[PDB]
Symmetry: D3
Subunit: 150 residues, 6 copies
């Protein structure tokens, strides 16, 4: 279905480096529709819930500390295969191993400062969207380009 | 002071044409700091208050109808001389008369579909910011590049 | 030989989305030489001949209907390994599976609206070129950059 | 009326420098619709007719010789105020005096190698269009973005 | 003459903000030829000689202190009217008053952090070039594009 | 360690095609720091030493002849995993096989005119850096963005 959604968040390093517009533009050019967007400074509670799956991993501490250190731009994009496509556009966890053309491939060098977060599955996307956005903050009627879909 | 702020809104035509990222990027590259950002579909009340100054002018009706027809991306940028600078970056009311390099100059052709709104003075910026944003939605501690300011 | 040629066509969705220049520019930057170029609205006969190989496949009907629905920009590029290189630059049949950096990877989401057509072999390139272009519409003496070839 | 048209031609220097796509893209982003497009090597007769107004001026000889020396990309764009707008996007006769953001301002240095030709009035546009294009080579039903026009 | 030269220097703020390539690219696209290029951290003696004309002005102290605080990328471009053209591409002393499309217009906000230095006349260009570059560091035989000059 | 360095050289074809800025910009956007930069025309001795490893290979003759035929822009970038990352950004030896998004993938077609040279290992990087640069031409104290490294 062309109504799948994914959650993306430009982390504090991405915001501080002035890459918000660059990132949003890549997704708009692709044809995905922006259905939610806001800038906020995450609380420790939000950070810990969002990254809950990593609680027993060694990088969790710094991960949570870093995401709550400055503004984050949260967004929700809608479109066919958006979760997997958005990941391909981001690259892989390690920016140095991400291919030129992807976001981390073009702009990142350190795994701890990898610019953006993207849901890894439809299940985690649905969970993240509900965590960061209230229902009234999301567009209900989406209208993409019919030049995009058959 | 380097803490002046302006209100900018990518109108429905700008959002539908996929120019949100392009626009935000121009302001980030300039060095202005994003202190507020959200996507919403304006109510008639908000539209009428925002454009109140034009109530007796012939284009008011269509102006209000158009801005409430689809999503709008509202943002607040902070920096030295941001109100006047943001206007120069936008161009002038008529896109056809806007110079190549400005937003309306590069992307617009019709005055009724001129892509973006930018406050025209510090007084109207302060008024617009309070109309569209709640205080908690705005960053209090701004941190630009010291490579930007002396 | 540096005189191999390929046939590329920006489909109606690509034309309507304003991607003609973006596409031509990628090929010019690569170093391929434009030897034929024209905009036309394909007739049913041209569409059916061009896509003949797909006549018994399920998508043929919509394929032919779509390509004849609006203007198409037809072009012929010349250069060493242009057929295979042009395909790599396009991506793969499914835009969602095309890598960031390729045309379909950066701009497409639906297989039925995948923006551009590129010959898949030297044999099909030669056939397509003769179908879409008359001999007098093609440059005979090509002059690329000697900074491009040894 | 939103159906005004202008004639633009990327001269041989523009074609040789690989600026065709860059130029077309600027006009597509602006919102003008491509209604005619073809690459051809101008004959002396076409060159002399096109530039007839300059026959008694000192640069006419070289002008005609240069335009017939290599391929030219001819195009017709349609939109509100396209003739005057297309000129503003081109810059002025002298590239060195053209403002950054315009085509000649960004890419040219010599008046004799100023990249592109654009009609200077609706009257000359109508004359040039008829000289370079046959009626069947021009789109009859144009369909721009309603996000562009009110 | 097409052999005029100008001296340009990307200041420490421009270098720290990662704008070296962006700046060089604008001049290459214009058609000017790079005849000298090097990165160095200016000594106080070089800074004071370069900016000698401003010794009695209030901003001289900070100017000299800032230019010696980090790396600077020095370059010499050659071409017809390069001194005046390079200035137009830079903008004006105050970045906020510089037009969108120019370097300071697109990237700067503070006069003390205005990114780049460009000679203001042929006389000062010749003086600056001799101050920053040794003769053997400059190309003697320049070869631009004949697609650039008549 | 975040202080690894690699040697990159924009070859004469890259310089002549006006791709110096484009190339430097890709590395600056990635987050690598420029620690050395200069334009020079390589002597036969430098060319032969640099490419010594290829002395018994068939392409050595033309390789050495070509690199000494015009200006070359030599640079040294510093950052975590810069040697391997810089190679990924360049593409592979054959430009036609290089992926869209990489330098050779986007701009090259012939192996003999493949635009840029990048060290293939830390050992060869250290050797090349010492061959092309004198110690005083290299920054000793590097200062990247802490938004880049954890
Ligand atoms: C796996 C891993 C992740 N992290 C941090 C940065 C990753 O964005 C974040 C989440 O891990 P992960 O979900 O693997 O990455 P992605 O961001 O691509 O979904 O955890 C590290 O710092 N080091 C590591 O080795
Ligand atoms: C003056 C004018 C404005 N309008 C609409 C589009 C303008 O964005 C909007 C507000 O007018 P104005 O404040 O003049 O323009 P700007 O948007 O540059 O601040 O009113 C018209 O449709 N026609 C006109 O003649
Ligand atoms: C294979 C396939 C193709 N098509 C359409 C879109 C493809 O451009 C067109 C031709 O098929 P194909 O030659 O496989 O693709 P390409 O365009 O990459 O050469 O047919 C579909 O709609 N669905 C499909 O599953
Ligand atoms: C006026 C002028 C024009 N020309 C050439 C280049 C111009 O493109 C061409 C046509 O002149 P003109 O119509 O003035 O310029 P434009 O191209 O902007 O319409 O004549 C010169 O070579 N030198 C000159 O002084
Ligand atoms: C005139 C002026 C210059 N300066 C600094 C920044 C300018 O780059 C530098 C040189 O002055 P100037 O030569 O006027 O500017 P430009 O850099 O455009 O040649 O002096 C100030 O800080 N404040 C001022 O009011
Ligand atoms: C291997 C190879 C290299 N060369 C030339 C161009 C290569 O840049 C240069 C060095 O070879 P190599 O080190 O393989 O390539 P790279 O430049 O990617 O490090 O030798 C050829 O001309 N033909 C070939 O088959
Ligand atoms: Mg994950
Ligand atoms: Mg106003
Ligand atoms: Mg096929
Ligand atoms: Mg004229
Ligand atoms: Mg000065
Ligand atoms: Mg090698």
């Amino acid at each position: 279905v062309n109504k799948e959604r994914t959650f993306l968040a430009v982390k504090p390093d991405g915001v501080a480096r002035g890459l918000v517009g660059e990132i949003i533009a890549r997704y708009e050019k692709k044809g995905f529709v922006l259905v939610g967007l806001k800038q906020l400074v995450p609380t420790k509670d939000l950070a810990e819930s969002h990254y809950a799956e990593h609680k027993e991993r060694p990088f969790f501490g710094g991960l949570v500390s870093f995401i709550t250190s400055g503004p984050v731009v949260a967004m929700v994009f809608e479109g066919k295969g958006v979760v997997a496509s958005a990941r391909l556009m981001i690259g892989v966890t390690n920016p140095l191993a991400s291919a030129p053309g992807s976001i981390r491939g073009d702009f990142g060098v350190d795994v701890g400062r990898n610019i953006i977060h993207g849901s890894d599955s439809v299940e985690s996307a649905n969970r993240e969207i509900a965590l960061w956005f209230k229902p009234e903050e999301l567009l209900t009627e989406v209208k993409p380009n019919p030049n995009l879909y058959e």
